[PDB]
Design a binder for this molecule. Structure first.
Ligand SMILES: Nc1ncnc2c1ncn2[C@H]1C[C@H](O)[C@@H](COP(=O)(O)OP(=O)(O)OP(=O)(O)O)O1
Lengths: 540, 403
DNA sequence: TAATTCCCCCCCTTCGGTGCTTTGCACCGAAGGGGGGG
């Protein structure tokens, strides 16, 4: 290709790699010999002599289409010693962000990296040795004249070169949409099929003038188009078929693969849940360790299989309509959402199950889900959608007016989906008249890990319990728990703990600590609770 | 060109580009196409390893988009403020001036080329909607707006331009920060506008503040004719917290009134000793804390607290419990349900005040979740500078003690 | 051990660093696994 090379240098004070080639299978050696002979015929690699002291191990893998080998170089040392690059690939295109096009073509550039020349001064660092069949003769030594597969600079250089090659054609054809992901090209237009094919041939000729071939084997002309892991139809898109493993006994690696596949499926299949399956991966050590299902991962797996049984599709973006994201709660800090423009015509689906913080409530998790959906929607469509949330306007108003943080949700409306989001208790702003007043105290020593937790009541009642392996914070939480347990429906509580008061004032409904969970249950059980903080031992 | 250099031991900015809305991306693409047409920026490849985030804003009552580059990492590097004379020693009369107008003069920076060896540090990437194409990388060929070194390099030309104006009007204090000129006069507001028009025409041929109304926010104890145990407990906590700001605060009698377990609603009469102590603490709180001086070496920290009902409090300090300034930003609600917009406006106002008073933007401790801020702050930002900020993940200890 | 590569986005778990202080506890980012793309 006549494209100008990108100048590349090593990191300062660094030399080229000198890693010895490891032994290779005779099949791999034969495949590499054939590939290297073909490449040297085409000038993609050049024979080198003793003047080159560098070496890097090479190997081969199988391509997606078998009977063809991909030649890779273990450039880890060279990658360590290579200058840093800035990646221009900022993300992954999504079919939901595609607009409807009358005519569509998917093109792939052949031998992509090997069609882009490499900087000459860097070429000596790409030296490698193709070992001899079985052994005997010393191997043939080559160096790369093009972008090698396995070098950390090849993807960015190829992407920039492809952008430079494509820019004149896109300038001359502003009405043609071209999604370029590395070498994969999606070309959409509103032209007639004959005019579209003429434009496609023009684009192929333009690419060929730059040394980029577009072989017919990967030239797709009819729907459905296999693009970027999706199947694209004229009016809908789906994911390429997802095969969930069906194993009698599961290992850690199997569970990880299943969770990843379910996460991938959740972008268009609504209701995917992975929490119970992800919990199986907590505390495990060996990837081959057999993990039995916990009868909660069994139900989750059955539900996910039921969801995947029916085929679902997404629709294409219509910029003249409105984006609407609807959120539903699923329990245990899990949320699903659907982004659509017409009812029951999903552009996209997704889930949010991140557990941020030791103590949270449903409102904070809903806000986090809204933030995630907003960022994803800005990425895909360039705008934020209107939200349909299962939270009352009054509940959100109370929360964000009484909360000490700056919280906001973009333009949204309430949807009465039965699992509504609400705060399960409220702390009184003023002490309750006539309610019993508890003064709680929890102390612990840092040496013996022993402490006490108790309360004194203005009516004369008092109690104190000892605690072992408990810190001061745990003792204060225990003292508040004691006050909650021994009180009536209404209670005033005075604590010296800023930590416990700060935890409780956030109004959590779930926590990673069982003590906080018990406190939350007691608080929900109560009718009126006032929490007061007193500074220190100065006075009760 | 001035041979700008990075700080010794520093590498260069490598900050990723955050996603942008479609209108922002279109505005950025148009602006960058125009800038590349006139040689202000040039396209670069991925072999440049540096990057700074970029976005677009719409100024106050302006229909034109302005490109903004987040040069905060590069500004933390780039010791250029000494090699080229930094912005003149901060005038102390700007804070005492009557009317201060902020003018955008960053466009002039585009008239002076940037040192070639430094250009690679000004790299930025325009993103694409739905990742249709790889991000388009540019680097600056001229002095960029938002970089700390641009005013330092342009200071010679700035003084040359302003000299015919400063000599004619010696009563006007002109300060320069980033792309902004803060020009202050004690004249009448109509004469101030006329003189501003003359200065604008001077700049062409070559937003008003009021620092006099900036009032401190003292901590005030509540006044009651009958104090309950809860009220005395809250007062004692407030005074115990204030004792770290005002040495000499006594709570002995008030704490003596809080011995023996009693109902929070119970009304306890105040003893004469407690009453005197409360009066003495109130008059101690009335006078401002003495012994706090701005140290130009140390950095400014601005803490913000949300008080509800569209009210925020802030404290600018260099050492804990030693406040250089305390204030309250009130939006009085008024069809303003957006907490993030209010916090962004408060941050901009506090930064403007800090620039006017000490010549430095403070480091903000924002009372917001990080993701919410990074998602929404660019939608309401109007300033051409960006202060450093961090996010507090714990409820403030002060709470209502700053009211 | 046995197979050894690169770049991008995502999720879920683990672990170490940071900050305030009640030297424990909460939060966050990077790296490991997985998914997907080329
Ligand atoms: N496993 C991989 N390791 C390293 N680089 C890869 C890998 N897969 C793809 N790439 C890079 C290098 C390829 O030249 C480029 C495009 O991928 P791909 O289309 O699969 O291959 P190709 O262009 O070399 O082959 P083909 O001619 O068969 O299309 O992306």
């Amino acid at each position: 290709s006549p494209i100008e090379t990108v100048p590349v240098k090593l990191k300062p004070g660094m030399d080229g790699p000198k890693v010895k080639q490891w032994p290779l299978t005779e099949e791999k050696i034969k495949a590499l010999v054939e590939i290297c002979t073909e490449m040297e015929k085409e000038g993609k690699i050049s024979k080198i002599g003793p003047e080159n002291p560098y070496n890097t191990p090479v190997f081969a893998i199988k391509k997606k289409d078998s009977t063809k080998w991909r030649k890779l170089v273990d450039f880890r040392e060279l990658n360590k010693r290579t200058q840093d690059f800035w990646e221009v690939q900022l993300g992954i295109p999504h079919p939901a962000g595609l607009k409807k096009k009358k005519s569509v073509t998917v093109l792939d550039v052949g031998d992509a990296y090997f069609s882009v020349p490499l900087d000459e001064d860097f070429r000596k660092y790409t030296a490698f040795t193709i070992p001899s069949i079985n052994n005997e003769t010393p191997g043939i030594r080559y160096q790369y004249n093009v972008l090698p597969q396995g070098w950390k600079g090849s993807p960015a250089i190829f992407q920039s070169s492809m952008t430079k090659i494509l820019e004149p054609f896109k300038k001359q054809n502003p009405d043609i949409v071209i999604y370029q992901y590395m070498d994969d090209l999606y070309v959409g237009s509103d032209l007639e099929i004959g005019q579209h094919r003429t434009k496609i041939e023009e684009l192929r000729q333009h690419l060929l003038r730059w040394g980029l071939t577009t072989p017919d084997k990967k030239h797709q002309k009819e729907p459905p188009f296999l693009w970027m892991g999706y199947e694209l139809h004229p009016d809908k898109w789906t994911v390429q078929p997802i095969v969930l493993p069906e194993k009698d006994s599961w290992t850690v690696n199997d569970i990880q693969k299943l969770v990843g596949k379910l996460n991938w499926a959740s972008q268009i299949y609504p209701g995917i849940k992975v929490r119970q399956l992800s919990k199986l991966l907590r505390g495990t050590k060996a990837l081959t360790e057999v993990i039995p299902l916990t009868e909660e991962a069994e139900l989750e797996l059955a539900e996910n299989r039921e969801i995947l049984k029916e085929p679902v599709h997404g629709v294409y973006y219509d910029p003249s309509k409105d984006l609407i994201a609807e959120i539903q709660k699923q329990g245990q800090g899990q949320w699903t959402y659907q982004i659509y423009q017409e009812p029951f015509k999903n552009l996209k689906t997704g889930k949010y199950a991140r557990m941020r913080g030791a103590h949270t409530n449903d409102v904070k998790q809903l806000t986090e889900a809204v933030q995630k959906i907003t960022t994803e929607s800005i990425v895909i469509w360039g705008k934020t959608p209107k939200f349909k949330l299962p939270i009352q306007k009054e509940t959100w108003e109370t929360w964000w007016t009484e909360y000490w943080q700056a919280t906001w949700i973009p333009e949204w409306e309430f949807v009465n989906t039965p699992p509504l989001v609400k705060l399960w208790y409220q702390l009184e702003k003023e002490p309750i008249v006539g309610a019993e007043t508890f003064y709680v105290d929890g102390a612990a020593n840092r040496e013996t890990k022993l402490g006490k937790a108790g309360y004194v009541t203005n009516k004369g009642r008092q109690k104190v319990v000892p605690l072992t392996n408990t810190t001061n914070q745990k003792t204060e939480l225990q003292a508040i728990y004691l006050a909650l347990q021994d009180s009536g429906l209404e209670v005033n509580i005075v604590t010296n703990s800023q930590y416990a008061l700060g935890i409780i004032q956030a109004q959590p409904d779930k926590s990673e600590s069982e003590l906080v969970n018990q406190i939350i249950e007691q608080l929900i059980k109560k009718e009126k609770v006032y929490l007061a903080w007193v500074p220190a031992h100065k006075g009760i | 060109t001035v041979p700008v250099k990075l700080k010794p031991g520093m590498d260069g900015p490598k900050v990723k580009q955050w996603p942008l809305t479609e209108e922002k991306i279109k505005a950025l693409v148009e602006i960058c196409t125009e800038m590349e047409k006139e040689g202000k920026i040039s396209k670069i490849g991925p072999e440049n390893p540096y990057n700074t985030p970029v976005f677009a804003i719409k100024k106050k009552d302006s229909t034109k988009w302005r490109k903004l580059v987040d040069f905060r990492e590069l500004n933390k590097r780039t010791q250029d403020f000494w090699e080229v004379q930094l912005g003149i020693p901060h005038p102390a009369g700007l804070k005492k001036k009557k009317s201060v107008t902020v003018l955008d003069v960053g466009d002039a920076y585009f008239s002076v080329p940037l040192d070639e060896d430094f250009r690679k540090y000004t790299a930025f990437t325009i993103p694409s909607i739905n990742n249709e194409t790889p991000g388009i990388r540019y680097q600056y060929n001229v002095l960029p707006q938002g970089w700390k070194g641009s005013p330092a390099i342009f200071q010679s030309s700035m003084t040359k331009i302003l000299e015919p104006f400063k000599k004619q009007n010696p009563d006007i204090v002109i300060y320069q920060y980033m792309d902004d000129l803060y020009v202050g006069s004690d004249l009448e507001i109509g004469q101030h506008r006329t003189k501003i028009e003359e200065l604008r025409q001077h700049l062409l041929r070559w937003y008003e503040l009021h620092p006099d109304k900036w009032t401190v926010q003292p901590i005030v104890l509540p006044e009651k004719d009958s104090w309950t145990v809860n009220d005395i407990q809250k007062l004692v906590g407030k005074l115990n917290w204030a004792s770290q700001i005002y040495p000499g605060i006594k709570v002995r009698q008030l704490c003596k009134l809080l011995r023996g377990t009693k109902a929070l609603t119970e009304v306890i009469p105040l003893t004469e000793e407690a009453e005197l102590e409360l009066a003495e603490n109130r008059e101690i709180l009335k006078e401002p804390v003495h012994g706090v001086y701005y140290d130009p070496s140390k950095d400014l920290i601005a803490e913000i607290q949300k008080q509800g009902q569209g009210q925020w409090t802030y404290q600018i300090y260099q050492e804990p419990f030693k406040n250089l300034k305390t204030g309250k930003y009130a939006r009085m609600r008024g069809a303003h349900t957006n907490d993030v917009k209010q916090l962004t406006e408060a941050v901009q106002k506090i930064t403007t005040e800090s620039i006017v008073i000490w010549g430095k933007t403070p480091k903000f401790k924002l009372p917001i979740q990080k993701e919410t801020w990074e998602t929404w702050w660019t939608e309401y930002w109007q300033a051409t500078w960006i202060p450093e900020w961090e996010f507090v993940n714990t409820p403030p200890l002060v709470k209502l003690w700053y009211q």
